[PDB]
Amino acid sequence: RQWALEDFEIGRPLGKGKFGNVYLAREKQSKFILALKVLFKAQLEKAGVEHQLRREVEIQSHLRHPNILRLYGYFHDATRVYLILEYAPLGTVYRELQKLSKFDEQRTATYITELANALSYCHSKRVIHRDIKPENLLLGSAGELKIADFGWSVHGTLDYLPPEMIEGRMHDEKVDLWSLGVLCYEFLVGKPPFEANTYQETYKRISRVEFTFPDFVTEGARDLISRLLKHNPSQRPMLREVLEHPWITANSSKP
């Protein structure tokens, strides 16, 4: 298993990333269909993030969960690093938001449950994501949600970052609960709650936790979102309490 690019047939582009492209691919020997993410050494090195990727690969390979995207392996050549990923045939939740605009409560609750289960397992293995956002949420063949990208895990737009990360503070696993809250809002409304036209204004609004709801967001959803988007990490609920929220249980199709 000392992989090389010549072991795969490369197919169509699945996405364009900051640091690299993702392509569909097929391993020649087995015909195993997978995704291949190609990052550039020169660009990671120059941005000082090459280590972060040593860490991701190290971390994501101790994780095994149906709502976390698998990293099967990795290799590299003169100038590029390749991640061999599980292929998620239904694409990103980002693209799904574009197509649909916003999701009903049942899709939203179902997705939060999947996320919360995934993050609970991560927290139990002492892992914090730090980078939950719809681009990094992939959909398996049955439409099951899959967390992608552990490039920023430990232990650009600001839209999904909590106050303690933008205000330059110590953070912990409650980072991921803020993220749930941002996503729960975005799913129901179709834009994240602190969205603005400038970095400076978005920063301001995250820092103050300044957001409002459209009249159509139901009271149960407002309750859950408000509990998650607390400025103080320690006032945010545990993952187990998110899963027990009556709005989540009333509306989720998964357990």
Query: Least distance (Å) from ligand YPH to the CB of residue 102?
Result: 15
Q: Does 15 bind ligand YPH (CB under 6 A)?
A: yes
Per-residue binding string, ligand YPH, 24-63, x by CB under 6 A, is -----------x-x-x----x----x--xx--x-------
- Is 86 known to sit in a ligand binding site? yes
Six-digit token string for 74: 């990795």
Segment contacting ligand YPH by CB under 6 A, of 109-117, 148-156, 170-178, 241-249:
148-156
DSSP string over 236-253:
SPPHHHHHH-HHHHHH-S
**Residue 136 in marked binding region:** yes
Query: Should residue 82 be labelled a site residue for ligand YPH when binding is judged by CB under 6 A?
Result: no
Task: List all residues 6 or more positions away from 197 whose beta carbon is below 8 Å from its beta carbon.
Answer: none
Q: Give the residue, chosen from 134, 151, 181, 233, that forms a contact with ligand YPH under the rule CB under 6 A.
A: 151
Residue 102 CB contacts under 8 Å (≥ 6 apart), including other chains = 187, 188, 189, 190
183 binds ligand YPH per the rule CB under 6 A: no
Cα→Cα distances 235→34, 43, 77, Å: 41, 39, 47
Nearer to ligand YPH by C-beta: 39 or 180? 39
Asked if 56 and 153 touch (Cβ cutoff 8 Å), the reply is yes
Return the SS3 of 255: coil
CB of 126 to ligand YPH, least distance (A): 19
Please count the residues of this chain forming the interface with ligand YPH, following the rule CB under 6 A: 28
Contact 186, 135 (CB under 8 A): no
Nearer to ligand YPH, 14 or 224 (CB): 14
Q: Which residue among the candidates 104, 131, 172, 176 is catalytic per the annotation?
A: 131
Q: Using the rule CB under 6 A, give the single segment among 111-119, 145-153, 193-201, 222-230 that binds ligand YPH.
A: 145-153
- Asked about 7 being catalytic, the answer comes back as no
Interface with ligand YPH (CB under 6 A), residue from 7, 41, 66, 91: 91
Question: Least Å distance between CB 103 and ligand YPH?
Answer: 13
CA distance 168 to 148: 25
Neighbour-count burial for 37-74, b at 16+ CB within 10 Å, e otherwise: bbbeeeebeeeebbebbebbbebbeebebebbbbbeeb
Which candidate, 144, 152, 161, 136, places its Cα nearest to that of 59? 152
Q: Are strands 145-147 and 8-16 parallel, antiparallel or unpaired?
A: unpaired
Which residues are annotated as part of the binding site for ATP? Answer: 18, 37, 86-88, 135-136, 149
Q: Which residues are near ligand YPH by CB under 6 A?
A: 14-15, 17, 19, 22, 35, 37, 39, 44, 49, 52-53, 56, 83, 85, 87-92, 95, 99, 136, 138, 148-149, 151
- Supply the residues annotated as catalytic: 131
